[model samples]
Target: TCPFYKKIPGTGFTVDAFQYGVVEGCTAYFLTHFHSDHYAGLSKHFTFPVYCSEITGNLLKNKLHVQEQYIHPLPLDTECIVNGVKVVLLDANHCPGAVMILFYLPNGTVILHTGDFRADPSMERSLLADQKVHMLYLDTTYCSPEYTFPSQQEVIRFAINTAFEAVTLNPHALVVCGTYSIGKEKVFLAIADVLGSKVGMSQEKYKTLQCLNIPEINSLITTDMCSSLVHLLPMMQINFKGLQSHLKKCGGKYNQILAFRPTGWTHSNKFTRIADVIPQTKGNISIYGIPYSEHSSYLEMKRFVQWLKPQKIIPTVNVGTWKSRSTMEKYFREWKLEAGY
Candidate 1:
């Protein structure tokens, strides 16, 4: 009777209980974030009240524009009891409105569901101090040491420096990058800090940021702020080549053009082709290979799994439970090698 039925890839079972009759009796449902993976089945089958953080609520209502009558907005670090199930929402520092959920069942079983979290020191410290967690649903997207990268701040700094250098080197060129609309807000903020001067934002990106109430991180100009600084438009709506031509037609008055590259460009061949389409111009086009990822790295995921010391760790959001178990086991082995685990 509902659209909540999505067949699990390569598996007979569905992702959620809605595939069966279990959803009709579910006490409550909590959404960790507004990402498509987490909320894909939201409007279809689960008609019950959805619990989430205030930031997430605003993002869902304003950004995604999904209307639901049973949206219970809770703040971070707060606890709510639904059907005698004690649930706490913890900060998942992966994105603007992400969260990690902690559930305390009446059976004394404590479960922590990390809804796509990056292993950030701040996030770890914040959650580690709380009560011991029994079971953990982890996000181990990169469960290999080879995927390691510098901190988010470091990546941002490097991107800023490169963008500035590229622009200054060729004062008469345009630079364009691409990033996801929702996930790369912080990176844009970092770019803004480096730009210092106002930069332009696409109408879509500006609207996305404004809807989320994200405070302006930089003096980056948008059409709204174009009057104050160099006007930059988003690369999505206008073809990058056309935009470049327009800039050139203006006699290359602007010193540099900075564009946010799409998030998937790092892993996808298709994205690489997309990146290749930028017309070769006098201005240097640099792609900052920063791992601005929303999921935790192997080390971070390992650390959280160790800290929780959960009886069983289940990985969700692309990483399966079996793979997560294996990865955690390997991490444990590595830890033993290093520090006698």
Candidate 2:
């Protein structure tokens, strides 16, 4: 069964519960990333002390305009005591500033809160490989078997190669990538790098990218629309009518539009050809909804659960329905047995 919504048992600290209103006794708030769902209730008017990684802090202040004093930017892999509980931040691998929180409670219990994460091999070595964790609050975005998606590397390579081929066939094709505020930068960044072309973004996103603090990306990003063939736009804006309007706005500088609508939910387990994944197309505009996700796949989730061997797992997503939550509960039993616990 799942624990209280986003609450760490036996503590006044809450993780990603801003949207639920103030916790009765919450002493502090732990934000995992800058995503809307996690930081929903947060506003420029809130009074609670927020803790997150330095990069997330930048987004909080610059993007959300949350007061600087209320935000506590913590360091990664280092221990810090808050209300007598030892806390450490580990990279979540989901977004630029996302982190999994490790808490050592005063009662000698170890709990790991994986806010939103992508499981990988390096996690086995970097995480508490030798420690016994009592509870693991997992990001269950892809916990079910049907949710399995391709590996990030494979999908990123596919995105790059797809863009490369499309641009090669039509040198004047405008490459547009669907993206969120923080995640999926890897795909378009790799596409731009491979194509040796610059990228364009809105002034708002450009400012947000600067807050990411990656100097190398600065050279690849251009504010001027005419200089870059590849551009990043909100997922909704990559549609046919949107692209048609955008092309017209560009005054016919580019002949056609090639868009990559990357997300894990669009993937199929039996996809053997590129056409199978293509959503739809207009005369000169095409959209490919590839299997690209920042969240862990079902296999990755199983691997992480087995390796960690936590006594209990608390599902973070897909728990609103009893049927959905029980479906995930069965997997936990199998993973625990396989882990020899």
Candidate 3:
């Protein structure tokens, strides 16, 4: 038996999910996406049944290698009851395998949790029709207007343009772009769609794509009408010497080779030097720093708060509670509503 709004032991706070004596108790845990912040606690601190979309489940199983017994797969937009609470999963356009969760309490109160999501009109339309939400837990990672980003399509176009420019400058050069594995698949598809050639993918990535049941994208270069543009086959591990050896093997036959890595390239000091050296070699590398973040912008957050008109709005993902708490109170004041932590 559980009481309403009871604080968990050791933590003097009430959260949606909490750890009980040996088992965690909640209506059901709905994981919005596989990102570290959203899902890092799964199978570690808590082991109760978790629900997510089929695509997200496949990603967790195949890519992250999460245990199967821990996951309960549900289709997008489907609603069901787990532990007496009604739950629904909605699309989150942040990445290939992302979702937003809506929960309905026994008292008929509705809570909407927007896991890392973007301002994609298509995705927004898909989610808005579900039900009226009373309380909204938003992903306010970009709660400032300055964090503006281009649409996904425009970012794709920029990546393609940059890749083409690199190839045109040096036919024998290899062009490498960096993005997250799932996010970069779209970039790979765009590259193949534009260049009519095959791109290489890591073996793990290939397995992930297959598990997700994504169709093999066709390339114009192939007569079979089907080409694995993103090669999921294993190649030598990427390092300075390995890249050089691979370039030598290509031997100018393919005027340009394009590769995609994660955005970590920019974060590492070592990659900074490599960026400088790329143009010097026969290969030219271009970095398209697209701000395709997975969180809502400041204006969106304000708009969402206005739409929900909740009695209280709370944020928990980041640190500095006092500052965030103060900001939230200030926002509520602007709306002429009483807000407190």
Best by lDDT: 2
lDDT of 3: 0.53
User: Which regions of candidate 3 are displaced past 4 Å?
Assistant: 1-24, 41-47, 64-69, 121-131, 217-285, 332-341
Model 2 per-residue lDDT at 188: 81
lDDT of 3 by residue, 1-341 (tens): 23332222222222333333323334345566666555554553345566777877877676666678877888787777765566677776677667776767777767766766764545446656556666666665655445444455665666677667765676454554443345446766676666556655544554555655456643312222123332222223333454555555544544444554433212332233222323223343222334344555565566656655665444544424678657655665575443331
Model 2: lowest-lDDT 10 consecutive positions = 267-276
Q: Is 1 or 2 the stronger prediction by TM-score?
A: 2
* lDDT against true structure, model 1: 0.57
Question: Model 1, residue 241: displacement in angstroms?
Answer: 5.6
Candidate 3 similarity to native, TM-score: 0.70
Between candidates 1 and 3, name the one with more favorable TM-score. Answer: 1
Model 2, 3-56: lDDT tens digits are 485888778999988886767888999999999988988889988999999999
lDDT of 3 at 166: 64
Residue 73, model 3: Cα distance from true site in angstroms: 0.9
Q: Tell me the tens digit of each residue's lDDT in model 1 across 13-33.
A: 222232234453345556777
For model 2, the local distance difference test gives 0.86
